[PDB]
Amino acid sequence: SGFRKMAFPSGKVEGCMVQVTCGTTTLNGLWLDDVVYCPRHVICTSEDMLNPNYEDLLIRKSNHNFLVQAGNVQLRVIGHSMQNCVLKLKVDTANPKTPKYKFVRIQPGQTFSVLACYNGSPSGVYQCAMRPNFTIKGSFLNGSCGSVGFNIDYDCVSFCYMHHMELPTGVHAGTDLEGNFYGPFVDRQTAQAAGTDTTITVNVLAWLYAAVINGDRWFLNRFTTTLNDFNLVAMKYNYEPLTQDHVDILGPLSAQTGIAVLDMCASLKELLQNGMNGRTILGSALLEDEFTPFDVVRQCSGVT
Amino acid sequence: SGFRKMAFPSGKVEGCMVQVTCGTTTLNGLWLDDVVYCPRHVICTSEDMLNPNYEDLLIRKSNHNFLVQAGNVQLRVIGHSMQNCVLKLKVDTANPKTPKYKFVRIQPGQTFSVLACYNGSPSGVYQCAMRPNFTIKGSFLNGSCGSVGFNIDYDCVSFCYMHHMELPTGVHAGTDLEGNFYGPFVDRQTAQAAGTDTTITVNVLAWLYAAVINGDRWFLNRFTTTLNDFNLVAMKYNYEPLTQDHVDILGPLSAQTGIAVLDMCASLKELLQNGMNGRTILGSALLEDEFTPFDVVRQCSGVT
Ligand SMILES: Nc1cncc(NC(=O)Nc2cccc(Cl)c2)c1
Numbered sequence: 001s002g003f004r005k006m007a008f009p010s011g012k013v014e015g016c017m018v019q020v021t022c023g024t025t026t027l028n029g030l031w032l033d034d035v036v037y038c039p040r041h042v043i044c045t046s047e048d049m050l051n052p053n054y055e056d057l058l059i060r061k062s063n064h065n066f067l068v069q070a071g072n073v074q075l076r077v078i079g080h081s082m083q084n085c086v087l088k089l090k091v092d093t094a095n096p097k098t099p100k101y102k103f104v105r106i107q108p109g110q111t112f113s114v115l116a117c118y119n120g121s122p123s124g125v126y127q128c129a130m131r132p133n134f135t136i137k138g139s140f141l142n143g144s145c146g147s148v149g150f151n152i153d154y155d156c157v158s159f160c161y162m163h164h165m166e167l168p169t170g171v172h173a174g175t176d177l178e179g180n181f182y183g184p185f186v187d188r189q190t191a192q193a194a195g196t197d198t199t200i201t202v203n204v205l206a207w208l209y210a211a212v213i214n215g216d217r218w219f220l221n222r223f224t225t226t227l228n229d230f231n232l233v234a235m236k237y238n239y240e241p242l243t244q245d246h247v248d249i250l251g252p253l254s255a256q257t258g259i260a261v262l263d264m265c266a267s268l269k270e271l272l273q274n275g276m277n278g279r280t281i282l283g284s285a286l287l288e289d290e291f292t293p294f295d296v297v298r299q300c301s302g303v304t
Numbered sequence: 305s306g307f308r309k310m311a312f313p314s315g316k317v318e319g320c321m322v323q324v325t326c327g328t329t330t331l332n333g334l335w336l337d338d339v340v341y342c343p344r345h346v347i348c349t350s351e352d353m354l355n356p357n358y359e360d361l362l363i364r365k366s367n368h369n370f371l372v373q374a375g376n377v378q379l380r381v382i383g384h385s386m387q388n389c390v391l392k393l394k395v396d397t398a399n400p401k402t403p404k405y406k407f408v409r410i411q412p413g414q415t416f417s418v419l420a421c422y423n424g425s426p427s428g429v430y431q432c433a434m435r436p437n438f439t440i441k442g443s444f445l446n447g448s449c450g451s452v453g454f455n456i457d458y459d460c461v462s463f464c465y466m467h468h469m470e471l472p473t474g475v476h477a478g479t480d481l482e483g484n485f486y487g488p489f490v491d492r493q494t495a496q497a498a499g500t501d502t503t504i505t506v507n508v509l510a511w512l513y514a515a516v517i518n519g520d521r522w523f524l525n526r527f528t529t530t531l532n533d534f535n536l537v538a539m540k541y542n543y544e545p546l547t548q549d550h551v552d553i554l555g556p557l558s559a560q561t562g563i564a565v566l567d568m569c570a571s572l573k574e575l576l577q578n579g580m581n582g583r584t585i586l587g588s589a590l591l592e593d594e595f596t597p598f599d600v601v602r603q604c605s606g607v608t
């Protein structure tokens with residue numbers, strides 16, 4: 001019992017973090033095999049950030065200008081290239097601690113763990129979700145760029161995010177491990193405003209199921225609804241529309257609790273329309289949307 | 305910017321988790337040097353749990369009855385002893401991955417990270433606080449016993465908790481690494497109810513400071529209060545009394561934000577008396593009390 005915002009154990013990713021310096025700029029890099037991945041903006045001065053021409057700024061950089069340090073030992077850089085918004089630094093030593101890994105590009109609503117790093121050193125780990133507006137609400141300070149987001153499937157680490165920037169609103173933007181930004185964001189110190197941060201409906205429903213499994217049942221009502229009726233209310237409350245795919249994904253949770261997906265939708269509809277009335281669900285006073293249906297199953301079943 | 309419920313990177317502790325089996329009972333153990341620590345209730349059948357006489361049950365156990373497995377390799381047990389509610393299993397091999405470590409007994413209000421494990425395998429990491437009633441609100445299933453709580457000071461892991469049980473209320477109880485339970489709890493399947501789960505006032509104030517640092521300032525008011533006046537309101541709302549020691553501990557946060565501790569107390573007093581009015585502070589609709597003043601400083605400064 002109990003339900004917590006839980007991150008994956010970070011050891012496998014801690015073994016991949018290195019420090020990358022280019023001129024006066026120091027940030028984090030991810031060392032997998034003989035390659036170190038990092039944000040390409042490591043080549044910029046805070047002055048270049050206003051309007052950087054990365055191809056041009058890169059011409060003035062050589063392998064010996066990228067200083068890569070793993071622990072207290074320097075790695076030898078034998079090649080460098082730009083792929084989208086990431087730099088790939090070929091080093092002469094394969095990371096001995098390289099876990100089995102994949103590079104995945106996640107969808108909005110997907111959750112992942114972030115290992116916040118500074119100077120190639122891990123400072124903490126927390127759970128995130130890729131917001132429907134393609135931002136993440138992280139906790140990142142100057143120097144945290146190159147910190148990564150990931151999921152673990154037993155012993156295979158799927159890297160899904162690399163931190164690049166903080167928007168003027170304090171929300172965060174980054175890329176997948178091929179250097180493609182999530183959403184419309186660009187690595188430039190310019191006005192970029194995020195779109196509507198809607199609520200991930202399928203995640204809230206998964207979390208309501210977790211609440212029922214853990215004994216918090218007060219919000220369960222005697223109603224049901226339809227996808228169309230529910231979605232009318234969801235739109236009004238800035239919630240993502242729920243599709244039959246989402247209902248299907250919640251099938252296991254529906255089966256384990258005996259609560260039909262549409263009945264849980266009706267409970268959610270009433271929570272939206274009536275509010276919590278000062279009550280809490282799983283110790284929260286707001287509807288949590290950063291647990292996927294897979295996360296709920298994983299936490300309620302004990303997958304290691 | 306951003307403020308997240310952040311756990312310490314868990315790699316150092318992942319390297320210490322082993323599986324311990326005694327008869328039909330399998331749980332987790334912590335392998336430090338040539339000793340494996342685990343809950344003594346590993347010697348019980350679910351039948352023994354009603355009224356166990358641990359000294360007596362232990363007489364029927366030999367070193368070869370404790371099966372310790374690290375990864376997929378069995379460790380040889382050459383000694384066993386009971387210290388309070390933990391068993392110490394002397395193995396013939398020092399853990400090669402033993403970090404620098406300490407055993408500390410924390411105070412209520414202190415936070416720590418938990419690496420939830422099953423069968424000696426880590427499944428997730430989350431941040432907790434020792435509640436004023438000496439329970440923790442964790443996320444633990446059957447088989448999670450022996451999972452540990454810890455803090456890290458750069459490279460030294462201070463172990464502060466070992467999981468032993470879930471109360472009939474779904475809250476959790478455990479020991480320090482000397483086997484002494486936090487609070488009045490006993491390792492017996494008997495009625496044990498927890499006391500009042502009061503709010504850790506110094507932690508809420510630290511979190512209000514973190515909110516101001518991160519731009520969430522709406523709740524700041526034009527009032528001040530005194531410790532005595534504030535504490536009258538705190539008592540009414542089941543909040544822990546605030547002492548001059550707590551004010552002192554918040555000094556750094558007060559200095560960094562320019563908000564006197566007693567003025568932040570007055571803001572908190574109004575939040576208690578008026579509620580949030582549907583607003584959020586750091587994306588939460590309730591006052592968070594599981595960040596200590598040290599945690600806020602650490603997260604807002606980037607300590608690795
Ligand atoms: N506090 C903080 C959190 N996360 C990242 C940073 N750095 C940051 O945003 N740097 C930067 C500025 C403009 C554009 C690009 Cl691509 C990068 C700072």
Ligand SMILES: Nc1cncc(NC(=O)Nc2cccc(Cl)c2)c1
Binds near residue numbers: 001492
């Ligand atoms: N769900 C769950 C979470 N955490 C622990 C357990 N096991 C559990 O409480 N076992 C047990 C029962 C009575 C007394 C003692 Cl000392 C241990 C189960």
